[PDB]
């Protein structure tokens, strides 16, 4: 279920990284990882494309990388609008998609 | 290419020898195919035609 810190802290202007770690057969063999922000009381949002790409008309403040059998969301300076639950998903075993639990971002 | 994730199984028939056959194909649908650049192809056919 894509091992992930439940929460991350950080004051405005601080650059944080949220990582998800899985098995090497799921994560390492295919570069298919996504990141979805769900702002409290809303539906999920689509903000990261492929392993390190961005959708159409999305800010460049988030990026990513895959290192070994884990990947991380590269986040620029924080602010009051970044208080949301981030989720990560990636290619599963055979023809399924595995998703994590969440990272509750707490802006200090 | 043959794009479809395929599996294999085998069956022992009597003594010794086993037989192999396709086990499953986990969900999607295949099309066997061959992609060739058209550019190069047209260039070739006319050069042949010239000679």
């Amino acid at each position, epitope marked *: *279920a894509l091992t992930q810190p439940a929460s991350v802290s950080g004051s405005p202007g601080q650059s944080i990284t949220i990582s998800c770690t899985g098995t090497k057969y799921d994560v390492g063999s295919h570069d*298919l*990882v*996504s990141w*979805y922000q769900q702002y409290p009381g809303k*539906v*999920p*949002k*689509y903000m990261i*494309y*492929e392993v390190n790409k961005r*959708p159409s008309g999305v800010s460049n403040r988030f990026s990513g990388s895959k290192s070994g059998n884990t990947a991380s969301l590269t986040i620029s300076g924080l602010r009051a609008e970044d208080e949301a639950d981030y*989720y990560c*998903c*990636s*290619f*599963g075993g055979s*023809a*399924t*998609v*595995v*998703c*994590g*639990g*969440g990272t509750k971002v707490t802006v200090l | 290419t043959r*794009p*479809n*994730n395929n599996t294999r199984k085998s069956v022992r028939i009597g003594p010794g020898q086993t037989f192999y056959a396709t086990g499953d194909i*986990i*969900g*999607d*649908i295949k*099309q066997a*195919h061959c992609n060739i650049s058209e550019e190069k192809w047209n260039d070739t056919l006319q050069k042949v035609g010239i000679e």
Partner: nanobody
Amino acid sequence: QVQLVQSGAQMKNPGASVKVSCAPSGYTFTDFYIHWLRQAPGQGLQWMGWMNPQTGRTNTARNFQGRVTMTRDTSIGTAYMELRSLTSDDTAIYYCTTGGWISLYYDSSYYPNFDHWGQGTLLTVS
């Protein structure tokens, strides 16, 4: 842009066999793939299954082999789920999405790229 349309409230006892619809509005229903997800209160996003609206072929998660069936109806352009043998532990928020593009040359069913989201429906079993 496109807007998905989901079903309404469903209140049932254990052994419900709930039918959940999702009718897209804007894109051709037989163009992109369909994924269903569940989000229990407190848990994260749990993927249920995908459907190919072209030929009806699906594949679900490992823990639903028997409880969750998914069918298409391409006359209207919607999709139907049937949630068999539900208990009170299955009280969760369900999401309808739009998956990748159906091609004739490569598999793109498992791509986790979920561009659009429905508004979300809650089932209560009690």
